[PDB]
Design a protein around this ligand. Sequence first.
Ligand SMILES: NC(=O)C1=CN([C@@H]2O[C@H](COP(=O)(O)OP(=O)(O)OC[C@H]3O[C@@H](n4cnc5c(N)ncnc54)[C@H](OP(=O)(O)O)[C@@H]3O)[C@@H](O)[C@H]2O)C=CC1
Ligand SMILES: NC(=O)C1=CN([C@@H]2O[C@H](COP(=O)(O)OP(=O)(O)OC[C@H]3O[C@@H](n4cnc5c(N)ncnc54)[C@H](OP(=O)(O)O)[C@@H]3O)[C@@H](O)[C@H]2O)C=CC1
Ligand SMILES: CCC[C@]1(C)SC(NC2CCCCCCC2)=NC1=O
Ligand SMILES: CCC[C@]1(C)SC(NC2CCCCCCC2)=NC1=O
Lengths: 255, 258
Amino acid sequence: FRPEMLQGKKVIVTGASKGIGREMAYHLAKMGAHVVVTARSKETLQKVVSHCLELGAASAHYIAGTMEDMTFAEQFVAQAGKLMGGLDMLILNHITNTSLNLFHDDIHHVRKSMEVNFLSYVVLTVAALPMLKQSNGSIVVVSSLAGKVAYPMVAAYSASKFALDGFFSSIRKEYSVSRVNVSITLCVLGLIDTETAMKAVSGIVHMQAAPKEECALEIIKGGALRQEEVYYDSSLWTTLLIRNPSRKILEFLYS
Amino acid sequence: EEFRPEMLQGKKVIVTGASKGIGREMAYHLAKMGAHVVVTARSKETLQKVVSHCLELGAASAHYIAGTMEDMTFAEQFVAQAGKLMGGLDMLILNHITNTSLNLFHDDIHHVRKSMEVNFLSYVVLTVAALPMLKQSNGSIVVVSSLAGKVAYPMVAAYSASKFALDGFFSSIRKEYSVSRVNVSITLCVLGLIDTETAMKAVSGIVHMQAAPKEECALEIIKGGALRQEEVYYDSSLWTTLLIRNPSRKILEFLYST
Ligand SMILES: NC(=O)C1=CN([C@@H]2O[C@H](COP(=O)(O)OP(=O)(O)OC[C@H]3O[C@@H](n4cnc5c(N)ncnc54)[C@H](OP(=O)(O)O)[C@@H]3O)[C@@H](O)[C@H]2O)C=CC1
Ligand SMILES: NC(=O)C1=CN([C@@H]2O[C@H](COP(=O)(O)OP(=O)(O)OC[C@H]3O[C@@H](n4cnc5c(N)ncnc54)[C@H](OP(=O)(O)O)[C@@H]3O)[C@@H](O)[C@H]2O)C=CC1
Ligand SMILES: CCC[C@]1(C)SC(NC2CCCCCCC2)=NC1=O
Ligand SMILES: CCC[C@]1(C)SC(NC2CCCCCCC2)=NC1=O
């Protein structure tokens, strides 16, 4: 990895107002990328754009809205496009707000989780592809342990996250033979410093929490190296245990 | 602790997507074991032709309810107006899927959405709808999935996302139910290539593997939900069974189980 890599670079970061998303903003701004950030929360985004500008961003812009809204999602990429001079890398990071609870019958939240953490990711990917094909760019899709392994209390979430792996890991095999030179990186994250995670695991989880500023960069690094996947967790056993190598082989044979 | 056709006799079993392929056979076997059976699917007389064949084999009770699992309400209600037909629900077999051909993904969000709605959401909806009854029956949910549901495949991106989703949701729920001492089993079935008409033709001149027999497949699925297993693996390759099990996942789930 060379940060010279992101020198003149055009990067969208969704879910960019707080947490791991913001920090990418800032890393991307330090590396003097161009950045367009998004979330629902307008007044927060003003604050990160201007922080990005301070930090050395080649340029920085926000566009606020909600990714339950597919036409906003599709419209978001075209404008993001036009603000910078095209697009080099698209980092899908946002998620519908969630917390730990047993699942009872909340079917609105299963649906919302599916639409916002999954479907919006497809809608943004479809819209963003022309520009990415022109730069041989990159999709970075942020997932989690619970999108690789099953965990109780995060059923909906987990379902949207498995979906992310399924859909994109499949798109990527398609791209490969389609001479579609857009890379696709799946980030698998354990617990991270962020305010909203720390508050959500409120004594429910006794798992060491990883620095958010560092995870942020790991995500960029990975996507910039066109890596199929990024694992990022504090525990040692997890990083070892989380990899599925028989998936890799099994895929070759079936290939 | 062996499998006995005897096991499924009192049992009120819903089968979905039963008007053809695996689903049909599943309802044949069930009836041969003398269970009450309700089946759904969109198309109506194909279902009549199944309810009817289902007595010739020796059910206990056979009905059907036509509707598209595209509509959450139908799903809510179908279950309701079906436990009402059998007295309770004892087993829920979920296996309907929205027609998917096999093409590279371009811009068909429509197909993606329909795929999530029909292939995943409806199963959740029906689970919710079926639960009061199952919690009581000590029932057995059984979700039919696929290799594409555990492993990546080109051509089936939207389909794959919906199968991968069934695993991440139903495995969590399994975990919650386990801690809630909710005594409902959840069986995830990973199926390889099966010689259904849909598959046969969907995959003609493209996926070059053996085609596990449909009628054998469906029994394996039942034996599975019958025995309260966490998963069943039915494919026609030795490689497959041998590689597809993921012991790291089970350990990772253990470690974290504390
Ligand atoms: N933190 C952790 O421990 C882990 C995080 N991850 C992944 O990290 C990514 C970021 O997580 P984290 O930073 O902790 O989460 P945060 O809750 O801190 O960040 C959430 C971001 O997404 C935004 N958001 C929420 N709803 C919507 C919406 N409907 N439309 C658009 N934006 C929305 C929020 O902005 P706003 O409210 O203003 O709209 C905010 O910018 C997620 O994909 C998560 O799945 C994975 C594993 C662990
Ligand atoms: N066949 C194979 O090789 C494999 C099968 N599987 C899984 O096996 C299960 C059954 O597959 P298979 O039997 O081959 O496929 P079929 O096409 O034979 O089965 C489709 C069933 O779904 C019903 N259906 C279709 N659309 C809807 C709808 N919108 N609402 C309600 N019902 C609908 C159909 O009835 P109608 O169209 O009349 O509505 C039919 O009874 C699926 O879950 C599939 O994922 C997994 C891997 C491989
Ligand atoms: C039990 C989940 C364990 C955990 C380390 S936490 C996670 N994602 C979080 C979901 C919880 C909602 C609060 C913020 C969202 C990010 N993924 C994981 O694998
Ligand atoms: C490339 C698909 C490899 C295959 C064995 S076939 C599959 N599911 C089928 C999807 C095909 C659409 C029509 C029939 C429905 C069921 N799952 C797999 O793993």
